Amino acid sequence: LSEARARLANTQGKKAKRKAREKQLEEARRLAALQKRRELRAAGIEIQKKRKRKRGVDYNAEIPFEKKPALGFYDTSEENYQALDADFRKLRQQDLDGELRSEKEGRDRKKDKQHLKRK
Amino acid sequence: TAARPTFEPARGGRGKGEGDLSQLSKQYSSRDLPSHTKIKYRQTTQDAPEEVRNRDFRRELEERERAAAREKNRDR
Amino acid sequence: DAIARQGQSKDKVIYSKYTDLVPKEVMNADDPDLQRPDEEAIKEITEKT
Amino acid sequence: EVVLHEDKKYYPTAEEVYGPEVETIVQEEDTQPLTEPIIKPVK
Amino acid sequence: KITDEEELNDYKLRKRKTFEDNIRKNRTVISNWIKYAQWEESLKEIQRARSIYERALDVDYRNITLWLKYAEMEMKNRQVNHARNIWDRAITTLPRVNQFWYKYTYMEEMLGNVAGARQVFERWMEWQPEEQAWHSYINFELRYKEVDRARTIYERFVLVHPDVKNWIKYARFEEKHAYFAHARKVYERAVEFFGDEHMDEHLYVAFAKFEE
Amino acid sequence: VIRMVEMQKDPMEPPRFKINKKIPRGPPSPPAPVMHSPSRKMTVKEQQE
Amino acid sequence: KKKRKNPDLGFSDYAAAQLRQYHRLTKQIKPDMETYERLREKHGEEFFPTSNSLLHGTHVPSTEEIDRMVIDLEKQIEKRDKYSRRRPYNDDADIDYINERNAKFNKKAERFYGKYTAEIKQNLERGTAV
Amino acid sequence: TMPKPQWHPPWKLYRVISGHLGWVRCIAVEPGNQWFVTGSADRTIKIWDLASGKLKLSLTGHISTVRGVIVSTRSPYLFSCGEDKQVKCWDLEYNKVIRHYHGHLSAVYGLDLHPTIDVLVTCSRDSTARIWDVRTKASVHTLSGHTNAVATVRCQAAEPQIITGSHDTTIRLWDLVAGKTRVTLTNHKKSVRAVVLHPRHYTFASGSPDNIKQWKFPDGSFIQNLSGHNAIINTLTVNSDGVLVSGADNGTMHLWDWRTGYNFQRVHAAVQPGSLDSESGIFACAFDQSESRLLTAEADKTIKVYREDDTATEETH
Amino acid sequence: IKGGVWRNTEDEILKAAVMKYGKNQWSRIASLLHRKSAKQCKARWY
Amino acid sequence: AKTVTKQRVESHFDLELRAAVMHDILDMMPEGIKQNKARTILQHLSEAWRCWKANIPWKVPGLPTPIENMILRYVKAKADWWTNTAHYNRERIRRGATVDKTVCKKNLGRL
Numbered sequence A: 001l002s003e004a005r006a007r008l009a010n011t012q013g014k015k016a017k018r019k020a021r022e023k024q025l026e027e028a029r030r031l032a033a034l035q036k037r038r039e040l041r042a043a044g045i046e047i048q049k050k051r052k053r054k055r056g057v058d059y060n061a062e063i064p065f066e067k068k069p070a071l072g073f074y075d076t077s078e079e080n081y082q083a084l085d086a087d088f089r090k091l092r093q094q095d096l097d098g099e100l101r102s103e104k105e106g107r108d109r110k111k112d113k114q115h116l117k118r119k
Numbered sequence B: 001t002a003a004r005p006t007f008e009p010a011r012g013g014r015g016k017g018e019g020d021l022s023q024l025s026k027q028y029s030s031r032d033l034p035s036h037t038k039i040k041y042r043q044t045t046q047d048a049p050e051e052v053r054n055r056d057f058r059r060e061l062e063e064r065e066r067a068a069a070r071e072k073n074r075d076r
Numbered sequence C: 001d002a003i004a005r006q007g008q009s010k011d012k013v014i015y016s017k018y019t020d021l022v023p024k025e026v027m028n029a030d031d032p033d034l035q036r037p038d039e040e041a042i043k044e045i046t047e048k049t
Numbered sequence D: 001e002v003v004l005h006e007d008k009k010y011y012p013t014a015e016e017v018y019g020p021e022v023e024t025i026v027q028e029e030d031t032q033p034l035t036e037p038i039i040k041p042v043k
Numbered sequence E: 001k002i003t004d005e006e007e008l009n010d011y012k013l014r015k016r017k018t019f020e021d022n023i024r025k026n027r028t029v030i031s032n033w034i035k036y037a038q039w040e041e042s043l044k045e046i047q048r049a050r051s052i053y054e055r056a057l058d059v060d061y062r063n064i065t066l067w068l069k070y071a072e073m074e075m076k077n078r079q080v081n082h083a084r085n086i087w088d089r090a091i092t093t094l095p096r097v098n099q100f101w102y103k104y105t106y107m108e109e110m111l112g113n114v115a116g117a118r119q120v121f122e123r124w125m126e127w128q129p130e131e132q133a134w135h136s137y138i139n140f141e142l143r144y145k146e147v148d149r150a151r152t153i154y155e156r157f158v159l160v161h162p163d164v165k166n167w168i169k170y171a172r173f174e175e176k177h178a179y180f181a182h183a184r185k186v187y188e189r190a191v192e193f194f195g196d197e198h199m200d201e202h203l204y205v206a207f208a209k210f211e212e
Numbered sequence F: 001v002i003r004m005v006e007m008q009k010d011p012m013e014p015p016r017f018k019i020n021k022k023i024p025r026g027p028p029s030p031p032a033p034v035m036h037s038p039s040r041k042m043t044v045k046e047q048q049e
Numbered sequence G: 001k002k003k004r005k006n007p008d009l010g011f012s013d014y015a016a017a018q019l020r021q022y023h024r025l026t027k028q029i030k031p032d033m034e035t036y037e038r039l040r041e042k043h044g045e046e047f048f049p050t051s052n053s054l055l056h057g058t059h060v061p062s063t064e065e066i067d068r069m070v071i072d073l074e075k076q077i078e079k080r081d082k083y084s085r086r087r088p089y090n091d092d093a094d095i096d097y098i099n100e101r102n103a104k105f106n107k108k109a110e111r112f113y114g115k116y117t118a119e120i121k122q123n124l125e126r127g128t129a130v
Numbered sequence H: 001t002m003p004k005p006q007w008h009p010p011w012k013l014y015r016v017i018s019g020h021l022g023w024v025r026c027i028a029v030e031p032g033n034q035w036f037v038t039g040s041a042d043r044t045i046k047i048w049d050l051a052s053g054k055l056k057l058s059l060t061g062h063i064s065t066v067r068g069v070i071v072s073t074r075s076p077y078l079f080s081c082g083e084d085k086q087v088k089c090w091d092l093e094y095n096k097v098i099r100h101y102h103g104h105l106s107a108v109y110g111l112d113l114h115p116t117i118d119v120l121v122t123c124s125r126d127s128t129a130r131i132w133d134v135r136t137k138a139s140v141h142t143l144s145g146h147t148n149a150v151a152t153v154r155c156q157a158a159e160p161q162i163i164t165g166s167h168d169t170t171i172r173l174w175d176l177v178a179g180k181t182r183v184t185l186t187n188h189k190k191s192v193r194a195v196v197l198h199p200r201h202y203t204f205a206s207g208s209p210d211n212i213k214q215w216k217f218p219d220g221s222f223i224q225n226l227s228g229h230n231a232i233i234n235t236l237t238v239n240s241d242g243v244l245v246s247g248a249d250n251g252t253m254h255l256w257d258w259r260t261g262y263n264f265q266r267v268h269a270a271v272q273p274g275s276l277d278s279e280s281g282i283f284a285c286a287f288d289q290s291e292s293r294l295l296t297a298e299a300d301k302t303i304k305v306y307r308e309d310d311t312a313t314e315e316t317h
Numbered sequence I: 001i002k003g004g005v006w007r008n009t010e011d012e013i014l015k016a017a018v019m020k021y022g023k024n025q026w027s028r029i030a031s032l033l034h035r036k037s038a039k040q041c042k043a044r045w046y
Numbered sequence J: 001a002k003t004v005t006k007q008r009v010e011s012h013f014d015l016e017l018r019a020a021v022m023h024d025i026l027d028m029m030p031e032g033i034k035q036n037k038a039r040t041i042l043q044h045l046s047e048a049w050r051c052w053k054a055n056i057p058w059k060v061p062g063l064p065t066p067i068e069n070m071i072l073r074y075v076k077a078k079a080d081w082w083t084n085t086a087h088y089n090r091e092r093i094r095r096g097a098t099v100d101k102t103v104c105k106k107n108l109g110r111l
């Protein structure tokens, strides 16, 4: 029965399971390098690192494959947009992304269940 | 995933002869050596367009149709 | 039409009006308007090409 | 009046589906083999 | 919790790399393009997103919701004249998509540009769209004022959509705004125009109800 | 006035530069307007069938 | 007292829902006659333009107009985001899925094949009989 | 009634040729009415006798379905293309392949010969058309600019020398010299799968499942709109007497007046005995050089041959 | 050393395994039930 | 532009069959269809081919008759290709011609 439940649950193969673990390990080593770099910037030690790749640094530096918006019949050279408020004392990685679909739905499912069982 | 269909093909115009001869490579196949470097043309007896222009095709077609039907009749 | 021809030239022919959607008339018979241009002009364009 | 499996005639005849005026031509293997050519050279 | 703009730019690097990789993978269906443009507009970096929508229109210019999202980004971020250019290019390249015309005549009315919406409606009646388009332009007029110009629109609409139901609706209009003599002139023009052998009952039914 | 001589090319000289480098396909020419008919009307029943 | 009924039929088109949504927004709006008569008296001859008059590249809307447009468009985005209402999740039904996507695919199977596969489910619930 | 249409005598089937083992996807007539080629999905090309309807030769060599076949008028050659990705020249002196035209990234759907230059043009599924020199087997130009598979192509000697419709619902009129689009005609709503050229009047027709359209040549003006044959049409062919033939995927075939745009006959032919009701379909149709026989390559692995009915007017609208 | 009498537990695992794997994969179902082969699972089903 | 030589033949055939079906369903749907639902019809065609090979009678209870007829058409076409390839390789194996071992196993499995 235990093997029956454990095999009725599974849908993933070898490569999906190694990629999920690789994603968790990449997240862990990213938080570790983040802590090391945060300490080096907090005390203040300007050790620079390397980069060995052709593409990839072209994303933050500039607009990647930029197409200019086609212009005509209306002057649009004067108007501009206002940048985002930084606010780096409340802002979190979850805040930029927005709430998760599973998280919100999960929450409601909770509420739903609660009300049903209470009634 | 890995095993997946296509739903769009690979487009042409970005390799070996497509825009600037792929910037003039010095690589060439053995199938790209000179071969049949002379176009053969239709001669006067074959079906040259001088001979095809004046021909009434309907009479000759009807005659060949009649001969084929007569052959099929005389066989059985 | 000028907002339609951004990167095109001035002699490019594009269709953007509703008068381009209405059918023309029957164009009755052997009219010298709808004719393949000229056999010597055909030979000239053939030689150029 | 039993019909064996060896006959079992489905799919009625080409003369029955197209009629008498249409002449039906069933062509398996061909006249003039691949050595005997189409448009002939000037000999 | 993110500190100063180094770690913020690292997060932006990871997200833009993920989106550009998804674009490189598929290059088709615009959910990747729209999601990447929404993520770029959510961080108020809308020039990146202008580039994203222009690239996505280079991929597929006949996809109407892509135009709708790009123009509603430029309306949402207070860039009126950009969005105005976008709607003009939209109604130029897709003249049969009525969505663009309804939203652009709605934007010009919400911005207070009356005559701009009049000119867009006249460009729209150049294409001879449908019943609902002419009714929306009549409703635009009657919402403001101008029973005479709306009557001219009705004249054009009965000349370019000959149908007994449209003459009945214009008759009901001339009833409801108390121009019974003008309505009678419309009646005497309609019953002569339709002829003798074609008509269905409804014209003479509504005209008998009027004279009742 | 400038006298131009074409440089004399070495026969025993291999290709000079890398050519295998590849960049993605650029933007196509400006989109053409569609000139379609007015959207024949779709019904709920046929949409379900 | 007035009374108006407007239910929805089936989907059938992306343009019919647009038209319904446009009739809703265009009945909700209210015109200001003061700004209208002001711009009319300022513009004069060209206030009733043709397709080709001159004013295409002239209008500059003030802050109140663009604020009204932005607030209206935010309300329209909210009304669009409320389109697919989540149906309440009961856990008393015998679940026949092991994933999160399997439940919705079984729901689609019950949508499409649910009219035809009505005897076999009865056979299952009565004990694989009949 | 603004026009008065010319009376054309109705057509009738008189010969059903059979012997392919796959969908007959192409057909073409020799310049001398002695024989005609078909190409089919049984990976062969069959020379048939045009008078007797007898199989004259069978030529193997393709790896996949044969999609287009054409006989050259200036040279004694037989050009063929396939889903193989292979474009071939068959020397009919030897009945062997002498030249293969390499460079299509995917399946090749049609091909046409330029009538005066010795230049082959081909359609492919990789959204391109290619321009080949016959003598040097090399790609002169790659006509790119369609976004979906390219279905049909034609050639003139006069202006725009290459006209091609495709599955992106557009039609591009090109420049053979430059290699760039001159006119993009977007009027169709569904995929253009057949373009055809009129022999005299310097107009052309184009077909898609919504409707069929007639068009002036220099810049593509709208002239007319021939409607009523609403199925997926695969081929169009023009008679010099102004008879237009539209054959569809559902086997239905309509006969049309070129000038007035009038439908004078509808032909719904029947399938072969073993065949299935869902298998009625026309992939190709061609007139002979006498323009008095109509050869249709069907989806029931048949060649059906039609000729005019010799009985006088029982017709005229 | 395969087979014998069928219990309710093996039959319910067999039902759930047909619900997961289908009626054309019997060696994936019989890997879920020891002391029962694929022919036995197929026969017990039908 | 790689050539379909000998080990790409079945993969190229089944690559082109899918494309022909895609073009036909893009032309066959009427004007107000959401232009989704291509993948499902392709799965119905693959399942119809499996049910042809298994000699299982294939019927989907609700399905539009143009889609059902088109799937039957292309399944008959793939049946013809499969069967003619089997006849050809069986004649080759009978005469003693140069054949692969994999084509012997595939041909036994088809026969």
Ligand SMILES: [Mg+2]
Residues within 6 Å of the ligand: none
């Ligand atoms: Mg495994």
